Amino acid sequence: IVGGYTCEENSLPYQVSLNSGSHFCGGSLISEQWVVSAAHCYKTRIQVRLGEHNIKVLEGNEQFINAAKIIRHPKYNRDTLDNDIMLIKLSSPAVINARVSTISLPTAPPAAGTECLISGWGNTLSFGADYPDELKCLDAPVLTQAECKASYPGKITNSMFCVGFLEGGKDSCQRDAGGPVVCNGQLQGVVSWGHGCAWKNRPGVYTKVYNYVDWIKDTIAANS
Amino acid sequence: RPDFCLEPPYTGPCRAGIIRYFYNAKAGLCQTFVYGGCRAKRNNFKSAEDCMRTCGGA
Numbered sequence: 001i002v003g004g005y006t007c008e009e010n011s012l013p014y015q016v017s018l019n020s021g022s023h024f025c026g027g028s029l030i031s032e033q034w035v036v037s038a039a040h041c042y043k044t045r046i047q048v049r050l051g052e053h054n055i056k057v058l059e060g061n062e063q064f065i066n067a068a069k070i071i072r073h074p075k076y077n078r079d080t081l082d083n084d085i086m087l088i089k090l091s092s093p094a095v096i097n098a099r100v101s102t103i104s105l106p107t108a109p110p111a112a113g114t115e116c117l118i119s120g121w122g123n124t125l126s127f128g129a130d131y132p133d134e135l136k137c138l139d140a141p142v143l144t145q146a147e148c149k150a151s152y153p154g155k156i157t158n159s160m161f162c163v164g165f166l167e168g169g170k171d172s173c174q175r176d177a178g179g180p181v182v183c184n185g186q187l188q189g190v191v192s193w194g195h196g197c198a199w200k201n202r203p204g205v206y207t208k209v210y211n212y213v214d215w216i217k218d219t220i221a222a223n224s
Numbered sequence: 225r226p227d228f229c230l231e232p233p234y235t236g237p238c239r240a241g242i243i244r245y246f247y248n249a250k251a252g253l254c255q256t257f258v259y260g261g262c263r264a265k266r267n268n269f270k271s272a273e274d275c276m277r278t279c280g281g282a
């Protein structure tokens with residue numbers, strides 16, 4: 001996250017870290033045994049880290065659970081980036097408590113102008129590599145689909161929407177992918193892609209979680 | 225070594241952070257970089273050995 005601030009400790013109890021060697025993507029806890037992330041975060045083995053704030057230091061609220069099943073959306077296209085969403089089933093249920101809990105799936109997609117919260121342990125610089133120990137947060141508005149398409153002509157599919165700023169300096173970045181965009185108490189987006197991070201006129205592009213509510217509920221049922 | 229060995233490393237637009245190798249022609253060796261997870265260019269290898277086999281150095 002570029003141009004954000006350190007989140008209050010464990011104030012985003014649905015935020016997870018995906019770890020393979022080290023932190024490489026985020027995710028969102030949506031049930032006791034299921035996490036939503038991005039399809040381009042796929043690896044064959046992933047350890048999910050819940051209850052984290054500082055990912056380099058033991059704080060005592062963490063739960064580390066290996067993925068038992070990892071399921072990419074069947075229409076994910078790795079060249080257009082269409083349908084960039086994935087589900088991870090935990091090998092055991094997460095313990096739900098004050099510092100680890102679920103985020104609601106959305107009942108309607110978010111209106112342009114809605115203020116949302118984007119979070120992750122991704123790069124904090126638009127140039128360079130400053131990967132933070134502590135979880136970062138960014139308050140940012142949903143853009144109109146027209147402005148989103150104008151910013152990235154020809155590239156915005158029906159699975160995508162933009163959140164952020166055209167003036168530059170505030171955005172998600174590498175190692176934020178798969179993590180949450182939360183608006184009005186609902187998980188509305190998955191961090192996906194952009195041209196650079198926080199560049200002028202190039203806002204963040206996110207997967208529209210609302211479009212996958214049925215796919216998520218049915219996939220959970222079929223694997224549970 | 226192929227022409228694409230001389231191209232700069234390419235993180236690309238996706239926002240994962242996946243460790244990959246590229247040939248750094250200035251240093252004469254394969255080095256690591258952070259790959260975003262999609263739209264890789266050709267100077268992008270999953271191991272140092274793959275990079276050295278194709279592009280040399282070291």
Ligand SMILES: [Ca+2]
Nearest residue numbers: 054057058059
């Ligand atoms: Ca920790």
